[PDB]
Amino acid sequence: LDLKSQLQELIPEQQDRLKKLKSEHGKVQLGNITVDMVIGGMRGMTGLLWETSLLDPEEGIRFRGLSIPECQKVLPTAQSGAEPLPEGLLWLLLTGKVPSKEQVEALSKDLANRAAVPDYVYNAIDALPSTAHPMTQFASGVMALQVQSEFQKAYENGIHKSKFWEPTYEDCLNLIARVPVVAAYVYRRMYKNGDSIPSDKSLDYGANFSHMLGFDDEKVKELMRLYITIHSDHEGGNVSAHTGHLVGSALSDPYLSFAAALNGLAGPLHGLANQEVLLWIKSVVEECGEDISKEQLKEYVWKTLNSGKVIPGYGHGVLRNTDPRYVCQREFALKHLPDDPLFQLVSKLYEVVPPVLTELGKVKNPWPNVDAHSGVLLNHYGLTEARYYTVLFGVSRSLGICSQLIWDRALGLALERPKSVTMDWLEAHC
Amino acid sequence: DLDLKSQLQELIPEQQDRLKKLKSEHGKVQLGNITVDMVIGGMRGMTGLLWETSLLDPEEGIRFRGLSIPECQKVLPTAQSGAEPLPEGLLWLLLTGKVPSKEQVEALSKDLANRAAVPDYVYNAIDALPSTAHPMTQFASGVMALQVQSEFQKAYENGIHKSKFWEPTYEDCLNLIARVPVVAAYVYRRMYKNGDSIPSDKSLDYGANFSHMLGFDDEKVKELMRLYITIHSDHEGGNVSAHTGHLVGSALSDPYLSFAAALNGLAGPLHGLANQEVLLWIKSVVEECGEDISKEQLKEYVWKTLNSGKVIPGYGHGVLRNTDPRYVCQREFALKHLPDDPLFQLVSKLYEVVPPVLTELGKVKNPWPNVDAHSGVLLNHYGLTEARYYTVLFGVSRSLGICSQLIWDRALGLALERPKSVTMDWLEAHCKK
Ligand SMILES: [Cl-]
Ligand SMILES: [Cl-]
């Protein structure tokens, strides 16, 4: 029933698993370090341990071994709702076990009680100019939340190393609860003239975020519940997850690690694909009309690709099949907005471009990912401010990042210290 | 030529060719092995990233572009009537790889002083936080406020070419380096001097202006800050703060975002508290044993202390067979400017007593101290006693090395950092075959 007690029971076995990996297989070779990897951003280098999720090359991303369709099947939904609740996903990442309906409701009320945000967090955000990037205002608010960090004081008070995960657990669960309040406050300030909406402790996680953003529609709540769940985690190799794990390895509290993760997530090469697709889709509907045939779209897709241009959300795939996170958002749109013209162009692109990409032979995997479909769903219901979309990404990704940060302290993972070299050193070795 | 950006523009194409040739000829050359111990131990022993501004010599210590600290002290220009190397000249060395003239250092000093303008909402952002907030938090939150004026964010939004990424990166870094002391000094005056803020002086050099804004106008403190900023400026890229900024920068985040994230890693107890731990420990030793402790009484204390399962702060943490040259150069300063300071005498006596004791016990590889065992008594002697703030001084200094590499990261067009992640299920499946 209680998440901290469930984690306490499950920790010792994985600790024993870790010791056996050192004792039995510590010298087992996983690959070779080459000059290509040191200069090419660790490309092809197995470098870190991330337990909460791993990418299956056949079934897509797996949250603790459960694929996206498996998650939709067994994760509890809200009463009067049909999409998997983000609380149940959070339970899965931390414990590895699918939660009951009662455990999700207990976790939902737990999150609602931890969502208190002190006034100096709002003061910190409001002190920034209106021109500040929403990711900057978001990250600055997280830095203000760091003042109430319980792991910082516990470490200063000399808590035992085997107890590090307990205040990390408290800070993470507090962070996960409070980050939507900060994220929605940034949204209301930039677009709703500071007309902030207080948190409702009766609602679940995704619905309370949608409510604080200014969207009380039940279908938007369903959209936000599904959005937070599917963007929650994706290995530890990405910049945001790696950053928080890297800052956390120095025994910084989760607020500092996640705030640093946001600065990495704010990178154009990391957290803007959602915005690139939506802006591109809107310009295509203006250039080619609303009801463009698939064959005229095929000629458009072919000319764009041969002109040296790419189709946003396409070509970036490392899966033999389409990203299951793309498919589930298509299922959502097919049920709740089939007449939306922007989705209709997304749907036609789903049919037309993958064959074109295969015929051109310039790209390995011609299938889209989740970023090719999330824009039209948010835009349809009124969340049109694409520049804010990375803030929504941050709220969801906090669930995966905080889950691994807890096991980093539960497993007692050491400080991350890759060795550095210079071009003089590499040339001297060759 | 007194133009720093033009010097960088001339030197970039050769370094780009060095990288391209390194891939074509030696891209497939093996540098080591990936093992399970390394993946589970935070990439310990794994050569993973490229850091050009410095590299550690196992015999001569850390080298700034191939120049050790004593070598740097000889050729780097100093202030008028002063002996410590100016951080501006060190910054020139890190950026260009060449030792600057006295005039080039002066040109960069006025350049930095002119870029040090800080808008009022940065102070508002910091003051919104409570006074009890950690100094690294108020500093990092202030750095986030400086990010609003980022020129690389706007330049990328306006679609500048990839081959010109370094130009707005250069502007942001020098702007960041110029203003980061202003924010850092404001945090110091706010937390410990009741908000009695001191404005920047455009006549002073970099290290002198920082000491001036912190509230220390004495020439001997300025000399200390010039030496402090210079020797802590950079130290490879494997440490958390340098790696973090490089990691956030690889996603094409501007230097303000990379440095603010770097500070959050630098605030980690395993990264930026060695300076604070040493000063607090020695002050407790002088209180437990009196002010004027003999060298033989310290051996008796150190022997009981080490045999009780305790450690001596600043000692044993060395990866150099000899003493860290950054410790030695600060010992030179203290032997010349404060030999009668009782706290330094304890550090000096520990320098004589502790290395022999540690070797007899055989538990430690290198029994020599590092820079963090000596910087505390220098700051504390002159009035900078707030040890909890010391990591902010570390951050201001380390911005010089981090920003210098961040410019070359875009100059060299280094790609996104994408190490592959695995789980224990995957590792166990890979070991059963
Ligand atoms: Cl991702
Ligand atoms: Cl260091």
Question: Rounded to whole angstroms, how far apart are CA atoms A342 and A190?
Answer: 25
- DSSP helix/strand/coil, A29: strand
Closest of B372, B162, B145, B163 to residue B259, by C-alpha: B145
**Within a domain: residue A409?**
yes
Experimental technique behind these coordinates: X-ray
Domain that holds residue B168: 1-273+389-420
Let me know if residue B426 belongs to a domain: no
Q: Write b or e for each residue in A155-183: b if 16 or more Cβ atoms lie within 10 A of its Cβ, otherwise e.
A: beeeeeeeebbbbbbbbbbbbbbbbbbbb
Do B56 and B108 reside in the same domain of the chain? Answer: yes
Three-state DSSP at B396 gives helix
CA dihedral B206, B212, B216, B219 (to 10 degrees): 60
Residue of chain B whose alpha carbon sits nearest to that of A64: B423
Structural domain count, chain B: 2
Q: Is there a single domain that holds both residue A284 and residue A332?
A: yes
Domain presence at residue B170: yes
B127 catalytic, yes or no?
no
From B111, B127, B201, B271, the catalytic residue? B271
Tell me: do A200 and A283 sit in the same domain. Answer: no
Domain identity same for B187 and B336: no
* Cβ separation A48–B39 shorter than 8 A: yes
Q: Nearest C-alpha of chain B: how many angstroms from A181?
A: 18
Q: Are residues A323 and A190 in the same domain?
A: no
Q: What are phi and psi of A118, to 5 degrees?
A: -70, 165
B294 and B223 in a common domain: no
- Residue B195 shares a structural domain with residue B83: yes
Q: Are A41 and B33 contacting, i.e. CB atoms less than 8 angstroms apart?
A: no
Q: How many angstroms is it from A424 CA to the middle of ligand 1?
A: 34
- Nearest Cα of chain A lies from the Cα of B336 at a distance, in angstroms, of 35
Cβ–Cβ gap A430/B25 under 8 Å: yes
Using alpha carbons only, how large is chain A's radius of gyration in Å? 22
**Catalytic site residue A242?**
no
What torsion do the CA atoms of A90, A94, A98, A100 make, to the nearest 10 degrees? -70
Distances (CA, A) of A310 to A366, B162, B349: 11, 17, 67
Q: Do A128 and A103 form a contact (C-beta atoms < 8 A)? A: no
Please confirm, yes or no, whether B317 is among the known catalytic residues. yes
Helix A205-213 to helix A101-113 angle (10° resolution) is 40
At B374, is the secondary structure helix, strand, or coil? coil
**A430 within a domain of the structure (yes/no):** no
Is residue B62 helix, strand or coil? Answer: strand
- Taking the CA of B326 as reference, the closest ligand is 2
**B285 and B230 assigned to the same domain:** no
**CB neighbour list of residue B355: distance below 8 Å, 6 or more residues apart:** B315, B367, B368
Residues A393 and A378 reside in one and the same domain: no
**Main-chain phi, psi angles of B372, to 5 degrees:** -70, -15
Query: Is A424 part of any domain?
Result: no
- Tell me how far apart the alpha carbons of residues B152 and B167 are, in angstroms, rounded to a whole number: 8
With a CB cutoff of 8 Å and minimum separation 6, the contacts of B151 are: B168, B171, B172, B175, B254
Task: Please list every residue in chain A whose beta carbon sits closer than 8 Å to the beta carbon of residue B243.
Answer: 246, 416, 418
Report chain breaks in chain A, C–N > 2.5 Å, as residues after which they occur: none
Say if residue A72 is in the same domain as residue A90.
yes
- Estimate the crossing angle of helix A3-25 against helix A389-410, to 10 degrees: 70
Determine which helix (DSSP H) or strand (DSSP E) holds A244, and give its type and residue range.
helix A239-249
CATH number at residue A21: 1.10.580.10
Q: Are A329 and A373 in contact (CB under 8 A)?
A: yes
Contact assignment for B257 to A266 by CB distance below 8 Å: yes
Same domain, A236 and A308: no
The answer to whether position B46 is within a domain reads: yes
Task: State which H helix or E strand residue B57 sits in.
Answer: strand B54-57
- Tell whether A426 is covered by a domain: no
Q: Are residues B79 and B134 in the same domain?
A: yes
Q: What is the CATH number of the domain that holds B299?
A: 1.10.230.10
Residues with Cβ within 8 Å of A12's Cβ and at least 6 positions away in sequence, in order, are none
The answer to whether residue B427 sits within a structural domain is no
**Rounded CA separation B103/B93 (Å):** 14
Write the DSSP symbol of residue B357. Answer: H
Chain Cα centroid distance, residue B32: 28
Contact call for A35 and B42, based on CB within 8 A: no
